[PDB]
Amino acid sequence: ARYDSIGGLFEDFTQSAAQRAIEVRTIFHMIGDVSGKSVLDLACGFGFFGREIYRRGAAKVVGVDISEKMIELAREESRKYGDPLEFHVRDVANMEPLGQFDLVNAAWLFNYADSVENLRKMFKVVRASLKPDGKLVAYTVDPDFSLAKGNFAKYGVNVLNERAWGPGYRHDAEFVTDPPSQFSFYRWSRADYESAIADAGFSHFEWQKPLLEADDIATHPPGFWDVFQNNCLQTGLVCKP
Ligand SMILES: Nc1ncnc2c1ncn2[C@@H]1O[C@H](CSCC[C@H](N)C(=O)O)[C@@H](O)[C@H]1O
Numbered sequence: 001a002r003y004d005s006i007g008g009l010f011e012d013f014t015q016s017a018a019q020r021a022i023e024v025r026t027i028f029h030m031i032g033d034v035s036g037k038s039v040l041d042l043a044c045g046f047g048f049f050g051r052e053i054y055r056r057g058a059a060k061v062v063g064v065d066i067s068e069k070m071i072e073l074a075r076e077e078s079r080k081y082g083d084p085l086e087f088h089v090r091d092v093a094n095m096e097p098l099g100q101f102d103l104v105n106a107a108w109l110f111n112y113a114d115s116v117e118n119l120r121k122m123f124k125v126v127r128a129s130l131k132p133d134g135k136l137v138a139y140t141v142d143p144d145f146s147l148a149k150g151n152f153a154k155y156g157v158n159v160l161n162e163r164a165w166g167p168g169y170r171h172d173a174e175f176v177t178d179p180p181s182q183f184s185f186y187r188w189s190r191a192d193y194e195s196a197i198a199d200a201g202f203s204h205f206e207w208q209k210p211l212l213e214a215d216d217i218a219t220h221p222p223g224f225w226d227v228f229q230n231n232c233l234q235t236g237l238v239c240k241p
């Protein structure tokens with residue numbers, strides 16, 4: 001797993017990157033009230049979203065990540081704060097079923113699907129993890145991002161290159177940390193995303209623009225967020241059965 005070489009550097013990135021405040025805001029806007037809900041946090045990392053979701057009143061939270069190192073960090077955080085989160089080390093595309101939850105949160109899951117086949121498998125895994133009145137809140141790469149139109153390094157993610165990869169694109173990137181933290185991800189088209197959504201049995205979906213606000217524009221130099229607005233690397237996505 002690539003994040004075995006990243007580990008605690010990823011938290012360092014989430015603490016310094018200008019984009020992270022916007023994405024956290026957008027994800028919790030999509031999620032809404034979590035009181036009493038059962039929650040599955042996929043590609044959970046050290047557990048940031050699942051753990052905050054528990055802090056905001058969720059009844060039960062389970063996290064899944066492919067990286068042993070990130071899950072080791074996730075379990076140590078749960079021990080440090082005595083919380084009841086449970087974690088699994090699994091590739092979500094081929095995950096054993098964990099049952100049906102009220103809410104699946106998937107922040108930076110689908111951009112690790114290395115083929116359209118695996119993108120479609122992940123969406124079927126999510127649907128199988130959802131109650132009939134549940135929902136998926138997801139955060140992923142905006143299909144429309146184009147590296148030539150503006151890099152994201154000033155927002156925390158230095159995208160190093162862009163290569164055709166079958167029907168999509170493959171990016172090598174690094175989080176802006178000390179030292180930089182290398183990772184690779186995939187940019188699948190909007191059509192392929194929506195087909196995976198439809199064929200996984202989600203009859204409703206909505207793309208969500210990141211929630212950049214007046215105060216964010218106020219406290220950076222004018223135009224700082226221009227690339228973020230006209231070449232956004234990130235998008236929200238809400239799906240319901
Ligand atoms: N196929 C897969 N299944 C599960 N987790 C995966 C995966 N591919 C990548 N990941 C994990 O996805 C994470 C992306 S970083 C996002 C971490 C966390 N959701 C947060 O936002 O704070 C990494 O921890 C990585 O190990």
Ligand SMILES: O=c1[nH]c(=O)c2ncnnc2[nH]1
Nearest residue numbers: 107108111141157185233234
């Ligand atoms: O936390 C993140 N994980 C990612 O995989 C990612 N990919 C692109 N841009 N930002 C990201 N942020």
